[PDB]
Amino acid sequence: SQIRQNYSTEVEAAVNRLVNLYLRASYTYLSLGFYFDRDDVALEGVCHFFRELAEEKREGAERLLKMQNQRGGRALFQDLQKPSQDEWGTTLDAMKAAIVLEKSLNQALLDLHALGSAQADPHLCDFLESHFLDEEVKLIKKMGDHLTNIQRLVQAGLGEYLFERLTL
Amino acid sequence: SQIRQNYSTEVEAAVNRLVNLYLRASYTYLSLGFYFDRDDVALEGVCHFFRELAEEKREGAERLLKMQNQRGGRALFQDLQKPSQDEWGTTLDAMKAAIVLEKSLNQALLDLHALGSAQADPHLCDFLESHFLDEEVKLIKKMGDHLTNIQRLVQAGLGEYLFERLTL
Amino acid sequence: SQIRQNYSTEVEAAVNRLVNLYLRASYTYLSLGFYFDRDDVALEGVCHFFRELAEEKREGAERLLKMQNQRGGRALFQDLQKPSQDEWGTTLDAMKAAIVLEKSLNQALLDLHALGSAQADPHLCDFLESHFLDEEVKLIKKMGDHLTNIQRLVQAGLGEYLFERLTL
Amino acid sequence: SQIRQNYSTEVEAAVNRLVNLYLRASYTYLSLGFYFDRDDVALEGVCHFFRELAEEKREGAERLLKMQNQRGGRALFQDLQKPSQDEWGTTLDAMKAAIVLEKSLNQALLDLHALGSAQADPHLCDFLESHFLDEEVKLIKKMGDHLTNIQRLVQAGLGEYLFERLTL
């Protein structure tokens, strides 16, 4: 590449993997959103919460792809694995599964930051810090806050309804 | 002081102590506010309630300091003791601890009013009446109203959630 | 903590200490502000300068406390020591004491950044860089500029008056 | 009087005396204002400061007269003594003379408050507190602040000019 400078093959490859992880997270949230839209689940606030997250994760993937080209690396796409579950249980179950998912994305971000630091690639390090690291910390805090409120609420059917109506 | 008139050393000293008490109350409310912001407590309305009170108590301290200088007394600051607890339990526990705190500030205000009256210092007496006495009575009534509603609500987890969502 | 990830006990503890340092700085500035409001000092611009800084330092402490919870650490408060002086001398004396204070806060920030880097905690490192490091550099430059102008001005009484009227 | 209730002859008489004191203060400030308007003194900011105070003191007298009638007492006017000086010296001299004057009015207010309290006349006590006591404390603080700045400024001719230009 005529533009490529200080951009290691290791980082290029890790950025392609992180794109896959963000698209997979987007897909998992799409499944979670539509599960809560089922007439036999019917929690519209929970559905909107996960659909909004699907869109956020897709946006993350696209920003990473933009960066990959800005640096002169080459986007390589892999299959996107189907989500780990077809049915997601209660709001509590689903929020637990979301925080597991977010912590795995955060750990991927931290790993790539570490790699960037080892490779002396400050543009990569700044890029993750300014667009992803604080967003993940904020989101995981929010999910943790939700999980605590869900747990304090679950006569389980009444709790789930009230959380969806008054928090989401 | 060239301006000092009818301002006893006793009152000057009691005003410095009351500044300390208001700053300590502010600090206690800061701790209460951040405790309810913990991801394993997560009651944002309770958090905002106490943070707003932190700011009110700090404002009170500053008005007292302004008055101290208006009268020609000299502000003397002491250490601010850390709050009595590191963790504040339930909303009920925290509201009980707040009303204990407010009654101790109110009693300090009443003591200083009594002192002012004994010293024939009507400016001090008017100052407490117009800026602090009615504010404390209003706040203690509000906390009493909250305590009653909290108590009537505590399936405890559901009650705490509903109070935070629908009152705070 | 269900949310805690890559957040060392060392950093958690250093963040609690830095909160104390910022609250202590806030308190020191409150004392400086009210000293310049004394009828026998009476430099209102100097008073507003330090009171504004009291508020900035309190805001800093609250942002650190917010971050502590966002990361799943636990806020622990200690006593707040009274400021080092009861009377602050001239504007020159007070500005010298402020720059000493700011350099000690800056060094604390730098120490915590170093710790964060040693612990591979990029979120902490970005947080200090984006909210505190440049603010301190800007403020210390401003105080240095003030100190130079104060010094060039001190017939001392006339200089102090003119600085307060035409700079602050 | 058909309306008179709980209004002692002692208080009625002291209120008439206080009216005289406020009108005398108004007159003294009128003289001070016009002295600083002399072409051989020529400090327009000092002139406006004292003329504004003339008007404030006259307003005070009129509020006291209104109150006297509201209570069913009878206004009795005495001669208004000419001010203590025909020429008022420097701004420093004049500000010293103003603070002496204000402290004598404040002491009169405090004496009348004490009388009102001895007579169990809470309307009188509230009236002085709400309209006069805090106004005097604020004004005496302001004059004290001015006196300190004037003193710090007095090459005397330059100091007097700068105070008038940059403070008043």
Ligand SMILES: CCc1cccc(CC)c1O
């Ligand atoms: C409002 C936060 C707070 C609490 C306790 C003490 C201080 C000193 C100013 C403070 O700002």
Ligand SMILES: CCc1cccc(CC)c1O
């Ligand atoms: C405000 C000028 C002034 C001074 C002193 C006395 C009187 C009588 C009304 C007056 O108007």
